[PDB]
Short mmCIF file of all heavy atoms in Angstrom, two decimals:
data_model
loop_
_atom_site.label_atom_id
_atom_site.label_comp_id
_atom_site.label_asym_id
_atom_site.label_seq_id
_atom_site.Cartn_x
_atom_site.Cartn_y
_atom_site.Cartn_z
N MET A 305 -8.70 13.64 -11.25
CA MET A 305 -8.44 14.88 -10.52
C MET A 305 -9.30 16.01 -11.10
O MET A 305 -8.80 16.91 -11.79
CB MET A 305 -6.94 15.22 -10.56
CG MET A 305 -6.10 14.37 -9.64
SD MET A 305 -4.35 14.55 -9.99
CE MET A 305 -3.67 13.48 -8.73
N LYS A 306 -10.59 15.92 -10.85
CA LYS A 306 -11.60 16.88 -11.29
C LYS A 306 -12.54 17.17 -10.14
O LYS A 306 -13.03 16.24 -9.50
CB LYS A 306 -12.37 16.34 -12.52
CG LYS A 306 -13.41 17.34 -13.04
CD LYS A 306 -14.21 16.86 -14.23
CE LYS A 306 -15.00 18.02 -14.80
NZ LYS A 306 -15.98 17.59 -15.82
N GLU A 307 -12.80 18.45 -9.88
CA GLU A 307 -13.71 18.88 -8.82
C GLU A 307 -15.12 18.37 -9.05
O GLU A 307 -15.60 18.36 -10.18
CB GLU A 307 -13.73 20.41 -8.70
CG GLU A 307 -12.50 20.99 -8.02
CD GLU A 307 -12.42 20.79 -6.52
OE1 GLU A 307 -13.45 20.46 -5.89
OE2 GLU A 307 -11.31 20.99 -5.97
N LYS A 308 -15.74 17.89 -7.97
CA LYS A 308 -17.13 17.40 -7.89
C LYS A 308 -17.40 16.15 -8.73
O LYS A 308 -18.57 15.79 -8.90
CB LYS A 308 -18.14 18.50 -8.27
CG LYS A 308 -18.09 19.73 -7.38
CD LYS A 308 -19.00 20.77 -7.95
CE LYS A 308 -19.10 21.98 -7.06
NZ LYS A 308 -20.00 21.76 -5.89
N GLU A 309 -16.35 15.45 -9.18
CA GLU A 309 -16.48 14.21 -9.94
C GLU A 309 -16.96 13.09 -9.01
O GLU A 309 -16.38 12.86 -7.96
CB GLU A 309 -15.14 13.84 -10.58
CG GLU A 309 -15.25 12.72 -11.61
CD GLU A 309 -15.25 13.17 -13.06
OE1 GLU A 309 -16.08 14.04 -13.42
OE2 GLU A 309 -14.41 12.66 -13.83
N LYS A 310 -18.03 12.40 -9.43
CA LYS A 310 -18.62 11.30 -8.69
C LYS A 310 -17.96 10.00 -9.13
O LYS A 310 -17.82 9.75 -10.33
CB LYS A 310 -20.14 11.28 -8.91
CG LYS A 310 -20.95 10.84 -7.69
CD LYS A 310 -22.44 10.90 -7.98
CE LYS A 310 -23.27 10.69 -6.74
NZ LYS A 310 -24.72 10.61 -7.07
N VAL A 311 -17.50 9.20 -8.15
CA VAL A 311 -16.83 7.93 -8.41
C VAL A 311 -17.37 6.79 -7.53
O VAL A 311 -18.00 7.04 -6.51
CB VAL A 311 -15.29 8.04 -8.21
CG1 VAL A 311 -14.65 8.79 -9.38
CG2 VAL A 311 -14.94 8.68 -6.86
N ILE A 312 -17.14 5.55 -7.98
CA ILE A 312 -17.38 4.30 -7.25
C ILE A 312 -15.99 3.75 -7.06
O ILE A 312 -15.22 3.67 -8.03
CB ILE A 312 -18.39 3.31 -7.91
CG1 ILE A 312 -18.68 2.12 -6.97
CG2 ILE A 312 -17.91 2.82 -9.31
CD1 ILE A 312 -19.96 1.29 -7.31
N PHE A 313 -15.60 3.46 -5.82
CA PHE A 313 -14.22 3.04 -5.58
C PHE A 313 -14.10 2.00 -4.48
O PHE A 313 -14.96 1.90 -3.61
CB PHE A 313 -13.35 4.26 -5.23
CG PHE A 313 -13.70 4.89 -3.89
CD1 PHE A 313 -12.92 4.64 -2.76
CD2 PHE A 313 -14.79 5.73 -3.76
CE1 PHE A 313 -13.26 5.19 -1.52
CE2 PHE A 313 -15.13 6.28 -2.52
CZ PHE A 313 -14.35 6.03 -1.42
N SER A 314 -12.97 1.30 -4.50
CA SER A 314 -12.56 0.26 -3.56
C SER A 314 -11.08 0.42 -3.26
O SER A 314 -10.32 0.84 -4.14
CB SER A 314 -12.83 -1.12 -4.15
OG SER A 314 -14.21 -1.31 -4.45
N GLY A 315 -10.68 0.10 -2.04
CA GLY A 315 -9.28 0.19 -1.65
C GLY A 315 -8.98 -0.16 -0.21
O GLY A 315 -9.89 -0.45 0.58
N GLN A 316 -7.68 -0.15 0.14
CA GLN A 316 -7.19 -0.43 1.48
C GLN A 316 -7.00 0.86 2.18
O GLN A 316 -6.32 1.74 1.64
CB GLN A 316 -5.87 -1.23 1.47
CG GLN A 316 -5.96 -2.60 0.82
CD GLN A 316 -5.03 -2.75 -0.36
OE1 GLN A 316 -3.94 -2.16 -0.43
NE2 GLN A 316 -5.44 -3.57 -1.31
N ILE A 317 -7.61 1.01 3.37
CA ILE A 317 -7.56 2.26 4.12
C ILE A 317 -6.65 2.12 5.33
O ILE A 317 -6.56 1.06 5.94
CB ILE A 317 -8.98 2.78 4.51
CG1 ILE A 317 -9.74 1.80 5.46
CG2 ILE A 317 -9.79 3.12 3.26
CD1 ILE A 317 -11.00 2.44 6.20
N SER A 318 -5.98 3.23 5.66
CA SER A 318 -5.08 3.38 6.78
C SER A 318 -5.36 4.68 7.48
O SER A 318 -5.93 5.59 6.86
CB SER A 318 -3.63 3.37 6.29
OG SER A 318 -3.34 2.17 5.60
N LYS A 319 -4.94 4.82 8.74
CA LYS A 319 -5.08 6.10 9.44
C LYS A 319 -4.33 7.17 8.64
O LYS A 319 -3.28 6.89 8.06
CB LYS A 319 -4.55 6.01 10.89
CG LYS A 319 -5.53 5.40 11.89
CD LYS A 319 -6.33 6.46 12.64
CE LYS A 319 -7.82 6.21 12.56
NZ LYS A 319 -8.59 7.37 13.07
N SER A 320 -4.92 8.37 8.54
CA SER A 320 -4.30 9.49 7.82
C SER A 320 -3.17 10.10 8.65
O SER A 320 -3.19 10.01 9.87
CB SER A 320 -5.36 10.55 7.48
OG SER A 320 -4.83 11.64 6.74
N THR A 321 -2.17 10.69 7.98
CA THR A 321 -1.02 11.32 8.64
C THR A 321 -1.07 12.84 8.48
O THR A 321 -0.32 13.55 9.15
CB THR A 321 0.30 10.77 8.08
OG1 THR A 321 0.29 10.86 6.65
CG2 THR A 321 0.57 9.35 8.51
N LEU A 322 -1.96 13.32 7.60
CA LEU A 322 -2.13 14.72 7.24
C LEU A 322 -2.57 15.58 8.42
O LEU A 322 -3.42 15.16 9.20
CB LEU A 322 -3.16 14.84 6.10
CG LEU A 322 -2.71 14.75 4.62
CD1 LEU A 322 -1.20 14.60 4.45
CD2 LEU A 322 -3.43 13.65 3.90
N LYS A 323 -1.96 16.79 8.52
CA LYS A 323 -2.27 17.83 9.49
C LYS A 323 -3.34 18.69 8.82
O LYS A 323 -3.03 19.56 8.00
CB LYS A 323 -0.99 18.62 9.84
CG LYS A 323 -1.14 19.52 11.06
CD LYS A 323 -0.56 18.91 12.32
CE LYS A 323 -0.90 19.70 13.56
NZ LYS A 323 -2.27 19.39 14.06
N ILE A 324 -4.60 18.36 9.08
CA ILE A 324 -5.76 18.94 8.40
C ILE A 324 -6.81 19.40 9.42
O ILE A 324 -7.01 18.74 10.44
CB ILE A 324 -6.31 17.87 7.40
CG1 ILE A 324 -7.41 18.44 6.50
CG2 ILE A 324 -6.75 16.55 8.09
CD1 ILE A 324 -7.71 17.59 5.32
N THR A 325 -7.46 20.54 9.14
CA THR A 325 -8.50 21.15 9.97
C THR A 325 -9.82 20.46 9.61
O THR A 325 -10.31 20.67 8.49
CB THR A 325 -8.55 22.68 9.73
OG1 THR A 325 -7.22 23.24 9.81
CG2 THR A 325 -9.51 23.39 10.67
N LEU A 326 -10.34 19.59 10.49
CA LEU A 326 -11.57 18.87 10.13
C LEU A 326 -12.76 19.33 10.95
O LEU A 326 -12.62 19.46 12.18
CB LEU A 326 -11.45 17.34 10.26
CG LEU A 326 -10.39 16.61 9.43
CD1 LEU A 326 -10.33 15.18 9.84
CD2 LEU A 326 -10.66 16.71 7.93
N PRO A 327 -13.95 19.49 10.34
CA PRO A 327 -15.11 19.80 11.16
C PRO A 327 -15.51 18.54 11.92
O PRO A 327 -15.16 17.43 11.52
CB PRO A 327 -16.16 20.28 10.16
CG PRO A 327 -15.72 19.81 8.85
CD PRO A 327 -14.32 19.31 8.92
N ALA A 328 -16.21 18.71 13.03
CA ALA A 328 -16.66 17.56 13.81
C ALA A 328 -17.56 16.67 12.92
O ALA A 328 -18.29 17.15 12.06
CB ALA A 328 -17.43 18.05 15.02
N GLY A 329 -17.47 15.37 13.13
CA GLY A 329 -18.23 14.44 12.30
C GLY A 329 -17.47 13.99 11.08
O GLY A 329 -17.88 13.02 10.45
N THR A 330 -16.39 14.70 10.70
CA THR A 330 -15.56 14.33 9.53
C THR A 330 -14.32 13.59 10.00
O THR A 330 -13.57 14.08 10.83
CB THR A 330 -15.17 15.56 8.67
OG1 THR A 330 -16.34 16.14 8.10
CG2 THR A 330 -14.24 15.20 7.53
N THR A 331 -14.11 12.40 9.43
CA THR A 331 -12.91 11.62 9.73
C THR A 331 -12.19 11.42 8.43
O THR A 331 -12.83 11.38 7.39
CB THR A 331 -13.24 10.28 10.42
OG1 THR A 331 -14.14 9.54 9.61
CG2 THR A 331 -13.81 10.45 11.81
N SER A 332 -10.89 11.25 8.47
CA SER A 332 -10.14 11.05 7.25
C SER A 332 -9.31 9.80 7.35
O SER A 332 -8.90 9.40 8.44
CB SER A 332 -9.25 12.26 6.96
OG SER A 332 -8.18 12.35 7.87
N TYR A 333 -9.08 9.18 6.19
CA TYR A 333 -8.21 8.04 6.05
C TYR A 333 -7.38 8.21 4.85
O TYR A 333 -7.77 8.91 3.91
CB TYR A 333 -9.00 6.73 5.92
CG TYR A 333 -9.80 6.40 7.15
CD1 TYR A 333 -11.14 6.74 7.25
CD2 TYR A 333 -9.21 5.76 8.24
CE1 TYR A 333 -11.88 6.47 8.40
CE2 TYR A 333 -9.94 5.49 9.40
CZ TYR A 333 -11.28 5.82 9.46
OH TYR A 333 -12.02 5.56 10.59
N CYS A 334 -6.25 7.52 4.85
CA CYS A 334 -5.42 7.35 3.67
C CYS A 334 -6.03 6.14 2.94
O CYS A 334 -6.57 5.26 3.61
CB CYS A 334 -3.96 7.12 4.06
SG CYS A 334 -2.88 6.77 2.65
N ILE A 335 -5.97 6.11 1.60
CA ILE A 335 -6.49 4.97 0.83
C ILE A 335 -5.55 4.63 -0.33
O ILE A 335 -5.06 5.49 -1.05
CB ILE A 335 -7.97 5.14 0.35
CG1 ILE A 335 -8.55 3.82 -0.17
CG2 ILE A 335 -8.16 6.29 -0.67
CD1 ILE A 335 -10.03 3.78 -0.50
#
Side-chain angles (χ1 to χ4, degrees):
Chain A
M305 285 167 178
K306 182 181 191 189
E307 284 287 344
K308 299 174 176 282
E309 191 101 306
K310 215 178 189 186
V311 285
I312 187 163
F313 67 101
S314 301
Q316 298 120 32
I317 63 164
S318 302
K319 278 264 128 190
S320 182
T321 51
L322 272 357
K323 193 100 189 81
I324 188 165
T325 311
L326 301 173
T330 296
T331 56
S332 70
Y333 296 96
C334 175
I335 192 172

